[PDB]
Coordinates of C-alpha atoms and ligand atoms in Angstrom, one line a residue:
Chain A
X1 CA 262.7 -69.2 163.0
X2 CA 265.7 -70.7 165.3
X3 CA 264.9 -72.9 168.2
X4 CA 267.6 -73.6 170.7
X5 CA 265.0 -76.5 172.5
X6 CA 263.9 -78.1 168.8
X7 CA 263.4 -82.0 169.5
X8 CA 264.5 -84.9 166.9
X9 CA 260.9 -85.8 165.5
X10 CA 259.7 -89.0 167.6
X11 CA 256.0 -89.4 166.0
X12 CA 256.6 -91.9 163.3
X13 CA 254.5 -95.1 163.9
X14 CA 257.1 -97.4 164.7
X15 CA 260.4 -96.0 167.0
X16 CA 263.2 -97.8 164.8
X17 CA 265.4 -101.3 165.0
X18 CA 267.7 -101.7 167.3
X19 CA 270.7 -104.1 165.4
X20 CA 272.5 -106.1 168.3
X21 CA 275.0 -108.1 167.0
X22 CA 276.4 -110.4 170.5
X23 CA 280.4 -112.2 170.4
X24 CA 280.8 -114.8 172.5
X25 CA 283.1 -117.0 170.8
X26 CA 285.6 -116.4 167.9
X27 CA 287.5 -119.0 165.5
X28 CA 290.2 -120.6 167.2
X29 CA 292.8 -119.2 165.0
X30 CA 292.1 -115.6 166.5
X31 CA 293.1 -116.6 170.2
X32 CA 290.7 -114.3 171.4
X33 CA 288.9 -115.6 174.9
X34 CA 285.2 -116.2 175.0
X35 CA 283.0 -113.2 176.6
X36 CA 281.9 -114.8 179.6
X37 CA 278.5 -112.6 180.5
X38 CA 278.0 -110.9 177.2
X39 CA 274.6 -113.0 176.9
X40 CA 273.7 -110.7 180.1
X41 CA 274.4 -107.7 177.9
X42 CA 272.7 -108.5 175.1
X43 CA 269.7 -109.6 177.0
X44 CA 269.4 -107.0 178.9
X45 CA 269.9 -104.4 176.2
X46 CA 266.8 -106.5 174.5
X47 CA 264.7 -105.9 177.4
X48 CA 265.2 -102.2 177.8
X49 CA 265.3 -101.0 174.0
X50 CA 262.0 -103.4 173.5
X51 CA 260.0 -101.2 176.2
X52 CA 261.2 -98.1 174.3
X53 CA 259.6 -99.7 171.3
X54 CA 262.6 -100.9 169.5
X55 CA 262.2 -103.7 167.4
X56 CA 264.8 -105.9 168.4
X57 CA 267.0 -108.0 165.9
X58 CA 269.8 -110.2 168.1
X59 CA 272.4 -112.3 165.7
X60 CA 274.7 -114.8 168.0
X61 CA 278.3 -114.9 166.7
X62 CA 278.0 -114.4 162.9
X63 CA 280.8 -114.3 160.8
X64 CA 281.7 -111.1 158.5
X65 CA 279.6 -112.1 155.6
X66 CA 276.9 -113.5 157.6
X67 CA 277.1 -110.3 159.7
X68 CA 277.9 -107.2 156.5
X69 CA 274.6 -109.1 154.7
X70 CA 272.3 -108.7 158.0
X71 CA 273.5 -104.9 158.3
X72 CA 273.5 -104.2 154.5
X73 CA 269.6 -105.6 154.2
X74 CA 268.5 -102.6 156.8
X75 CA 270.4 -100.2 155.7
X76 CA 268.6 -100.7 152.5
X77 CA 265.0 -101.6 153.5
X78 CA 262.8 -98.4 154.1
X79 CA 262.8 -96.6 157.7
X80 CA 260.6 -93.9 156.3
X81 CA 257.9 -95.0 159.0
X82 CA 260.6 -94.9 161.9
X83 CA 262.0 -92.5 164.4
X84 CA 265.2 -93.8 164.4
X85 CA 268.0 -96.3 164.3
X86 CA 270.6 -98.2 167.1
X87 CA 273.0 -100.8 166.2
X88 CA 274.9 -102.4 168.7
X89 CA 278.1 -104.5 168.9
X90 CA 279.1 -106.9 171.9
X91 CA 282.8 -108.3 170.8
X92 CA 286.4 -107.5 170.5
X93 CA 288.1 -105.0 169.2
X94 CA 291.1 -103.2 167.8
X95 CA 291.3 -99.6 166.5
X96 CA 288.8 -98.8 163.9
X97 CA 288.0 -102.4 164.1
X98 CA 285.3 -104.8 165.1
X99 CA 285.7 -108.4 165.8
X100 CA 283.2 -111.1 164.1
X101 CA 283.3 -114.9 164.9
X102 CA 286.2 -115.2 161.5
X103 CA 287.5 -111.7 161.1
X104 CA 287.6 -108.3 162.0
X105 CA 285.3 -105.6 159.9
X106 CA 286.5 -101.2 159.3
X107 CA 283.6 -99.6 162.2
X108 CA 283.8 -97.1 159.2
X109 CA 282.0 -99.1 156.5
X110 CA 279.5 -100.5 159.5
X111 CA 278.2 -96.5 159.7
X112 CA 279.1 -95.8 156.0
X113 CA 275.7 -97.7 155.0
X114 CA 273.6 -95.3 156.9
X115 CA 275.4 -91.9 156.1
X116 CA 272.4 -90.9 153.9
X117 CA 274.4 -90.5 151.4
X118 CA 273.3 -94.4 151.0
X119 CA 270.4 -94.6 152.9
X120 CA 267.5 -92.0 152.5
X121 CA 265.0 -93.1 155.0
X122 CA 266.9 -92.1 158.0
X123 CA 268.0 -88.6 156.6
X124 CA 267.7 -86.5 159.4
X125 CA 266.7 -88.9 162.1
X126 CA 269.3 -90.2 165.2
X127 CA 271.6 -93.3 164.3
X128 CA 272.5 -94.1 167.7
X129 CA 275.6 -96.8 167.6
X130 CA 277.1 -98.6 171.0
X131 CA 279.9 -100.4 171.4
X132 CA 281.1 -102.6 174.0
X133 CA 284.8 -103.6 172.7
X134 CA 288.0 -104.1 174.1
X135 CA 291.4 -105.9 173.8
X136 CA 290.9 -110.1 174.1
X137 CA 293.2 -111.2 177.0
X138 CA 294.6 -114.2 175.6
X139 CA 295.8 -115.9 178.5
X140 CA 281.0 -118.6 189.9
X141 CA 280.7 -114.7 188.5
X142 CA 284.7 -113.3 188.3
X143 CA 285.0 -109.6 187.0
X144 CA 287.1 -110.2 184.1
X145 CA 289.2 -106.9 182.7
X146 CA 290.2 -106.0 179.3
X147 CA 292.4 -102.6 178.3
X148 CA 290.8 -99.7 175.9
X149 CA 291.5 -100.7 172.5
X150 CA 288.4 -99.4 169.9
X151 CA 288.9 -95.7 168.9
X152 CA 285.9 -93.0 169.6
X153 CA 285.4 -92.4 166.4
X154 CA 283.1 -90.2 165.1
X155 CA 280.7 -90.6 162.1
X156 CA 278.5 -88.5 159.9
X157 CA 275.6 -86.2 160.8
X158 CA 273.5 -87.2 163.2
X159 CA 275.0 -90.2 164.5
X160 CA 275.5 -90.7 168.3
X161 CA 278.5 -93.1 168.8
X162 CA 278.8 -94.4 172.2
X163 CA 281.5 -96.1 173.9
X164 CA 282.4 -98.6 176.9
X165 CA 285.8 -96.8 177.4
X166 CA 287.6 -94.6 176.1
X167 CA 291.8 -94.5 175.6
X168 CA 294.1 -95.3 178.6
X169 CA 291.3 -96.7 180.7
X170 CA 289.8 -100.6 181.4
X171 CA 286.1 -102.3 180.1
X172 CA 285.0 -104.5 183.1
X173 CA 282.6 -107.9 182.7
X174 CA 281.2 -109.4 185.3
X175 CA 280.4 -113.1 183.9
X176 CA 276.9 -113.4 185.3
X177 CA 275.8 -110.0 185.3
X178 CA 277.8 -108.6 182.2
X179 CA 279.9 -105.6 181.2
X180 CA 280.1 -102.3 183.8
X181 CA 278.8 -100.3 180.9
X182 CA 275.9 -102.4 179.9
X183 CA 274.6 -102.7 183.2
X184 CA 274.2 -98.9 184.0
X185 CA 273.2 -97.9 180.8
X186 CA 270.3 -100.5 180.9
X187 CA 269.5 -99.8 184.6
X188 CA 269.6 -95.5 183.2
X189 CA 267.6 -96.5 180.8
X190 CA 265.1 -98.3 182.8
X191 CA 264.4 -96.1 185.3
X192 CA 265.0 -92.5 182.9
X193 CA 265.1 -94.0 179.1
X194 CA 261.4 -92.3 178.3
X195 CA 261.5 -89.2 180.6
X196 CA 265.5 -87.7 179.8
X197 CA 267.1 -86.8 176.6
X198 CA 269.2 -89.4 175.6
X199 CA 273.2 -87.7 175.9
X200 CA 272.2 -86.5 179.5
X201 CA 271.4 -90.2 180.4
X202 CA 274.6 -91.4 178.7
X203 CA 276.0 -88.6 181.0
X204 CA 274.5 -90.7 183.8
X205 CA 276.3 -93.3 182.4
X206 CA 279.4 -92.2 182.3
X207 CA 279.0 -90.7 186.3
X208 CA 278.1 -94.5 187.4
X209 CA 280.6 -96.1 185.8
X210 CA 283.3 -93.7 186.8
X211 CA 282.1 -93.8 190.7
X212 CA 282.8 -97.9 190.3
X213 CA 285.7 -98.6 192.8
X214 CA 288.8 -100.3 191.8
X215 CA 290.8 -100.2 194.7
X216 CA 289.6 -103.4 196.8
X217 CA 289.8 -106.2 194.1
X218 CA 289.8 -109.9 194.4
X219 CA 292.5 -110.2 191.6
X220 CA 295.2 -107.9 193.2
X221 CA 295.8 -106.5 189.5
X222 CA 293.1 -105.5 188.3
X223 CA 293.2 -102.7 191.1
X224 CA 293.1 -99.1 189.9
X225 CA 292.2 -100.0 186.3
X226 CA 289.5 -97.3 186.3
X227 CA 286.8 -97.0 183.4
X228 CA 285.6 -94.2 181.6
X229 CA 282.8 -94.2 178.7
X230 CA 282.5 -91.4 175.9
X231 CA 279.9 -90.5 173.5
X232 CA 280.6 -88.8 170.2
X233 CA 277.4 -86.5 169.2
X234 CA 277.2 -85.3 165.9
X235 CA 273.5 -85.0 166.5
X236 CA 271.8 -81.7 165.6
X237 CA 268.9 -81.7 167.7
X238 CA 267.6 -83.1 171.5
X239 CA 266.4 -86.6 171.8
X240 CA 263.9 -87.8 173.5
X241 CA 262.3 -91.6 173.7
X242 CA 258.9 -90.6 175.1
X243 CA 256.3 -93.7 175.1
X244 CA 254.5 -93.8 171.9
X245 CA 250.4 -93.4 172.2
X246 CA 248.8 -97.3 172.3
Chain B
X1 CA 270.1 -89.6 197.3
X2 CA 271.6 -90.1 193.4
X3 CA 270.5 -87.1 190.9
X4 CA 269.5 -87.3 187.2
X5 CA 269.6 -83.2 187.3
X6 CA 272.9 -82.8 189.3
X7 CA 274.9 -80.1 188.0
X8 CA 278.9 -79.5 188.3
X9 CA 279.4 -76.6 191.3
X10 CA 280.0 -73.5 189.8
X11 CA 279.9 -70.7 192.3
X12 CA 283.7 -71.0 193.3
X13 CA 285.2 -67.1 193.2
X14 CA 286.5 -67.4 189.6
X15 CA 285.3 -69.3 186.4
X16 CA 288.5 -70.6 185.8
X17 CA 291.4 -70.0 182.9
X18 CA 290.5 -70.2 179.2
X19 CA 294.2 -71.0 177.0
X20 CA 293.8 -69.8 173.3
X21 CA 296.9 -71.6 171.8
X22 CA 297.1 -69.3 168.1
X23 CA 299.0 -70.1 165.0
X24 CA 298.7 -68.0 161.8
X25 CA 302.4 -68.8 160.2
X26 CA 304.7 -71.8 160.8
X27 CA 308.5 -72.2 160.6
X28 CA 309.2 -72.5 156.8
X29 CA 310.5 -76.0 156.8
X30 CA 307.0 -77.3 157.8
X31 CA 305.4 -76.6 154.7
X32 CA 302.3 -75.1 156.4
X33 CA 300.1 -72.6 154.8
X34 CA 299.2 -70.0 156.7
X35 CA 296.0 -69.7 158.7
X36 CA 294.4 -66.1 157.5
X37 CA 291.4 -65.6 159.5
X38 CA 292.8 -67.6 162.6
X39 CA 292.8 -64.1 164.9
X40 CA 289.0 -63.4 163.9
X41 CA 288.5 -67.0 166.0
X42 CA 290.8 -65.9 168.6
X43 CA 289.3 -62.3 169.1
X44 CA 285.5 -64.0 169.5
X45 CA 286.8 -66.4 171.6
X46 CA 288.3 -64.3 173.5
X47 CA 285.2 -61.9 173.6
X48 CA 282.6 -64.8 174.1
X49 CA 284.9 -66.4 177.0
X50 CA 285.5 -63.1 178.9
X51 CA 281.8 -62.5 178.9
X52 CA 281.1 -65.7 180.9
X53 CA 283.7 -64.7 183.6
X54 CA 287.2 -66.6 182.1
X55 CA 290.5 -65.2 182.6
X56 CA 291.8 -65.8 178.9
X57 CA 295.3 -65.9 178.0
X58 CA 295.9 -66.0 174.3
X59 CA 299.3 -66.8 173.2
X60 CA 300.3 -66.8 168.8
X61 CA 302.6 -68.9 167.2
X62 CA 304.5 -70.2 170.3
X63 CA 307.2 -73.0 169.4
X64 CA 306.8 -76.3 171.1
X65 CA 308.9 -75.6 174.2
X66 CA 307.3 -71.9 174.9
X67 CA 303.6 -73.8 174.3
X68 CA 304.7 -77.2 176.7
X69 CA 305.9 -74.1 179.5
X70 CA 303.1 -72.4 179.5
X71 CA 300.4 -75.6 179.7
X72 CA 302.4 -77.2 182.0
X73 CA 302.5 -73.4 184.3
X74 CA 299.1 -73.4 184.1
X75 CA 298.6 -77.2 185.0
X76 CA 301.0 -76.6 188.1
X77 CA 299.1 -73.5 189.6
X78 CA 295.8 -74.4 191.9
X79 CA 293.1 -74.4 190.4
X80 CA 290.9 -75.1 194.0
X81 CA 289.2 -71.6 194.0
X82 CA 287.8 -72.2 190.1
X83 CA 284.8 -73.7 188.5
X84 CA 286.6 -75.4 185.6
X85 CA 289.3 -75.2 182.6
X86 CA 289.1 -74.6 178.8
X87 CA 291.6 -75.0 176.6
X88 CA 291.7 -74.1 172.7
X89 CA 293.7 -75.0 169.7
X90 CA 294.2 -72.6 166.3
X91 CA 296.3 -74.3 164.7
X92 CA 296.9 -77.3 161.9
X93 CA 297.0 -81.3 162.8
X94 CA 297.3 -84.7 161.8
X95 CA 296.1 -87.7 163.8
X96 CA 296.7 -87.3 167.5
X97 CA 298.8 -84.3 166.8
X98 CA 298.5 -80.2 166.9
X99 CA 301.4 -78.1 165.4
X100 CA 303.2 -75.5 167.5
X101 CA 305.0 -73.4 164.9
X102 CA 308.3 -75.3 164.6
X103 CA 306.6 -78.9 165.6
X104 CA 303.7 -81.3 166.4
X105 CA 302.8 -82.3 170.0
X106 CA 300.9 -85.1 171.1
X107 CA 297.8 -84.0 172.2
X108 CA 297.2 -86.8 174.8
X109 CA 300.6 -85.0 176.8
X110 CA 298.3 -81.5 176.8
X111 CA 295.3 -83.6 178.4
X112 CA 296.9 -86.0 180.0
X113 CA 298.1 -82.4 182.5
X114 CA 295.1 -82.4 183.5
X115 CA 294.0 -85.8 184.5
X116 CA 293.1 -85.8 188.4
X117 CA 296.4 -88.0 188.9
X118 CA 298.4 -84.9 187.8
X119 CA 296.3 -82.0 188.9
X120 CA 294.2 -82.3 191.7
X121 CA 292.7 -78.8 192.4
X122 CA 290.8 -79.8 188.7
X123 CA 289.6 -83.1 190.0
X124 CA 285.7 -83.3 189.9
X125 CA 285.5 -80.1 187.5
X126 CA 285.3 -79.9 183.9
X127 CA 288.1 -79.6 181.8
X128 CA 287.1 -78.1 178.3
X129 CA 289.2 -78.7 175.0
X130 CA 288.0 -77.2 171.8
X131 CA 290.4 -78.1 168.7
X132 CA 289.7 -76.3 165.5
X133 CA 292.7 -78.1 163.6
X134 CA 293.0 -80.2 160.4
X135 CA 295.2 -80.6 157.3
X136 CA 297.1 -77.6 155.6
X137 CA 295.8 -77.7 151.5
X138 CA 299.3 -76.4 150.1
X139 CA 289.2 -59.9 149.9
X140 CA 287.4 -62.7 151.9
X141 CA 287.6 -65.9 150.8
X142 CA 286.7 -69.4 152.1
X143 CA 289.3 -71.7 152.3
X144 CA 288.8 -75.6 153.1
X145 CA 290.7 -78.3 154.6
X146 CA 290.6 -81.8 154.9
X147 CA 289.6 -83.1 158.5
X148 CA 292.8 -84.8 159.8
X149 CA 292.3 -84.9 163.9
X150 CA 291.3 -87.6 165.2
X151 CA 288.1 -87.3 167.7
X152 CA 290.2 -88.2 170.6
X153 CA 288.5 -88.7 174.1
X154 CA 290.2 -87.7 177.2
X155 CA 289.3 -88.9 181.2
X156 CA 287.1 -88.3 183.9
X157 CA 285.3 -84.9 183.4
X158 CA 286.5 -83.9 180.0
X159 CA 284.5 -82.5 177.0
X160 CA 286.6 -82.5 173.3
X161 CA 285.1 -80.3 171.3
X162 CA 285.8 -80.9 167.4
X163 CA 285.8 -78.6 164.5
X164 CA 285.0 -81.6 161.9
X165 CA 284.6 -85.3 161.6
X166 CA 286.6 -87.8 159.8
X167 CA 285.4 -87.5 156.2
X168 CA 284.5 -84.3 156.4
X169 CA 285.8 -80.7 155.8
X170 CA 286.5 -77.4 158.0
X171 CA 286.1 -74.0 156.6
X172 CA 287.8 -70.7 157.2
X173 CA 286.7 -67.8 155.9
X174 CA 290.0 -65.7 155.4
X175 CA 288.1 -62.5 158.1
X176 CA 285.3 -63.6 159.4
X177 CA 287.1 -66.9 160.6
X178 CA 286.3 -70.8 160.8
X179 CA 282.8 -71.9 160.6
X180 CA 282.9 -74.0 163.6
X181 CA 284.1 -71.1 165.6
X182 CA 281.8 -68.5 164.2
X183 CA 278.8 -70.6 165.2
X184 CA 280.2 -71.3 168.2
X185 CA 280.9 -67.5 169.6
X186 CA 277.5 -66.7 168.1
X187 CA 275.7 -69.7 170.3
X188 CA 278.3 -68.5 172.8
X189 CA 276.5 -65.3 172.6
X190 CA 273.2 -66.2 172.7
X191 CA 272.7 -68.9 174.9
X192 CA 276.3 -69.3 176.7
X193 CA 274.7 -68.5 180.4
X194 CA 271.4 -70.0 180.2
X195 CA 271.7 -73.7 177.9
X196 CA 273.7 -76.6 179.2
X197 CA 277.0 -76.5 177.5
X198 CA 276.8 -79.8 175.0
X199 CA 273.2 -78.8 174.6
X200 CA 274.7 -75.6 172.7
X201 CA 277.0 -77.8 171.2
X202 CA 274.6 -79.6 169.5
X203 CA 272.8 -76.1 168.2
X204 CA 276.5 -76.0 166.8
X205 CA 276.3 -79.3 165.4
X206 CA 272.7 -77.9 163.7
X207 CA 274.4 -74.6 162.5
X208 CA 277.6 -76.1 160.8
X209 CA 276.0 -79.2 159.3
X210 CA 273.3 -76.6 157.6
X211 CA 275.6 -74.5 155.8
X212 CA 275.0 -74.9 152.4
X213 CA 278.1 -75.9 150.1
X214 CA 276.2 -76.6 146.7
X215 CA 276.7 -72.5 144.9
X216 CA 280.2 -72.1 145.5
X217 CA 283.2 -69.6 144.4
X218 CA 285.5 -72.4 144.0
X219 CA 284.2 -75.1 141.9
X220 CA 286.2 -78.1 143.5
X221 CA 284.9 -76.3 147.3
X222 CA 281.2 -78.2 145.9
X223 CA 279.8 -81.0 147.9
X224 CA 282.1 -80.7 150.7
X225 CA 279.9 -80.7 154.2
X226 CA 281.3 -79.6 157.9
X227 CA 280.2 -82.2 160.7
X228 CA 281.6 -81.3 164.0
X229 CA 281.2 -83.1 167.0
X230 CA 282.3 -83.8 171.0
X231 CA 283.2 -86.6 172.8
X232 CA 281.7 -85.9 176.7
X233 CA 283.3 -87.9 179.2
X234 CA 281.0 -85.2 181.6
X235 CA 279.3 -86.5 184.3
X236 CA 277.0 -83.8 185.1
X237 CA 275.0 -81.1 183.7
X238 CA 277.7 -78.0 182.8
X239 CA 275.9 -74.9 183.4
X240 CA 277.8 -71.2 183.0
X241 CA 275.4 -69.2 185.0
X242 CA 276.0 -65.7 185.4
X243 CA 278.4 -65.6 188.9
X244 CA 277.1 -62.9 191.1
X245 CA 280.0 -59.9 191.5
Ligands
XN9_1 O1 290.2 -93.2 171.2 C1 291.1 -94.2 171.5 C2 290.7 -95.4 172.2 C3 291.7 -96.3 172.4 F1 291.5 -97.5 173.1 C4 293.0 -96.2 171.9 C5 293.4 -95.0 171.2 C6 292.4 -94.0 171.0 C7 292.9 -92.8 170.2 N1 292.7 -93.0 168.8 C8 291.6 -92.5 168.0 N2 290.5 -91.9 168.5 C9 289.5 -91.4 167.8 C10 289.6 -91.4 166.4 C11 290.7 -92.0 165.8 C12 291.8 -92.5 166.6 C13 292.9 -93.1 165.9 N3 294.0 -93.5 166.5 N4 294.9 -94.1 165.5 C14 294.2 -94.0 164.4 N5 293.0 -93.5 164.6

């Protein structure tokens, strides 16, 4: 019965929503600097999961209620007629934390509302998460460098968790163009996002950022600040974006 | 001339060294229960490994100096004339710790010996860590623990491979051995030299999260699911092909 090559089931009529909540500014009372170029990221993100026929849901700097209500109302509306699910956070961060415009928010109670324990429809089918988060500084298009801060944490079965850096390393954004990370993963998954399973692009991902040089910098300090992204797979099965038949 | 389908080289003249780090009993003071079944995971380990052309070095219930020696020896030696590294962990943990038998080590030191910085004959190869570790409970039963080791990435070119999630629970039978490790030396088995290595990971991922934990022995043991996973810092496709003579 056992298939070593068995495929997440991708047939559904429509592919999913893809969540991207985008941080750009925070309270003053944080002292946490504004994301120059994150609007790049989440733009681009938009482009590229639309073609893969994500609905796409952007929210611009909400605060935690605003933001816990917006994620709490899909986890509870029905996905039965989707393939899967991406959510996607472009802010600050801090351990097991995530930064809103007011406050920070536990990553754990984010993928809590989608463990199938609490949300049926998406039993058995990806829950692919990405985070582009890092430590605020606090001091035409700069490359501005933040330190590793957000743990890779893991979440429950068949989630995908995917990271812009992992411990020890540096998250680069560019303030036209946007974060290191963001950029090759959209450009991977423009030219490969409906041909290759989705962990071997994220592979890709993690080769092109790596290959990024760091040792002739304008800034003399941010040189050899190297990044590497991670993924945490608890997925059970390959997974494929193939174009759905229109 | 960049390569969606580019593999890591491996057809050095050896695989590479495979550390099995083992630890049944710990020094009474600890509190530790001991690990019954732990050898079943080190003897298919050590089976499946061999098979695919490691050198494996098992080593049981070393204290933290002997284990720190012995990692940092193998760190130290070249490594130029070798596909790749795996390391593995039999033990108990909490957080960013595995216990030796008298004391807990910082796992980041172990990794952080291989890091291209401090070992360059590694640099551009994959270095494997699998950690089948988490919290001690205090003819062949199951016995369960509490997941308790953090899911902790490493650098360039590493794959950490985790018997359990936060949340979730590891089981050993007391022979036959852990889950995780039992469906990993049987996918080991089967598809070691032909799948891409976190392709069989995720047939792991399959096997463990389907184990059924409704009908059980113990009735407290009910409801309490095993989700593995890996963090891939991998930048290529990891193949182990079978190396010819
Ligand atoms: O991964 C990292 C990224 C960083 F920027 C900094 C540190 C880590 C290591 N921490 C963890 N990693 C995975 C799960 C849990 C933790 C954890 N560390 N303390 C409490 N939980």
């Amino acid at each position: 019965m056992f298939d070593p090559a068995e495929k997440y089931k991708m047939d559904h009529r429509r592919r999913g929503i893809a969540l991207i909540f985008n941080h750009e500014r925070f309270f003053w009372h944080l002292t946490l600097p504004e994301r120059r170029g994150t609007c790049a990221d989440r733009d681009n993100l938009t482009r590229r999961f639309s073609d893969l026929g994500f609905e796409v849901k952007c929210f611009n700097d909400l605060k935690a209620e605003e933001l816990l209500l917006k994620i709490h109302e899909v986890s509870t509306v029905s996905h039965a007629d989707a393939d899967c699910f991406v959510c996607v956070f472009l802010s600050h961060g801090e351990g097991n934390h995530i930064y809103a415009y007011d406050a920070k928010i536990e990553i754990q109670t984010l993928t809590g509302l989608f463990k199938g324990d609490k949300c049926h429809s998406l039993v058995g089918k990806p829950k692919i998460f990405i985070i582009q988060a890092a430590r605020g500084n606090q001091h035409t298009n700069i490359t501005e460098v933040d330190a590793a801060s957000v743990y890779t944490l893991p979440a429950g079965a068949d989630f995908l968790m995917c990271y812009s850096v992992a411990e020890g390393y540096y998250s680069h954004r560019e303030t036209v163009n946007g974060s290191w990370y963001i950029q090759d993963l959209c450009e991977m998954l423009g030219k490969y996002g409906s041909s290759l399973e989705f962990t071997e692009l994220l592979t890709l991902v993690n080769r092109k950022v790596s290959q990024r040089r760091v040792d002739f910098c304008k800034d003399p300090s941010a040189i050899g600040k190297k990044q590497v992204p991670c993924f945490a797979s608890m997925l059970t099965k390959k997974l494929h974006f193939f174009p759905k038949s229109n």
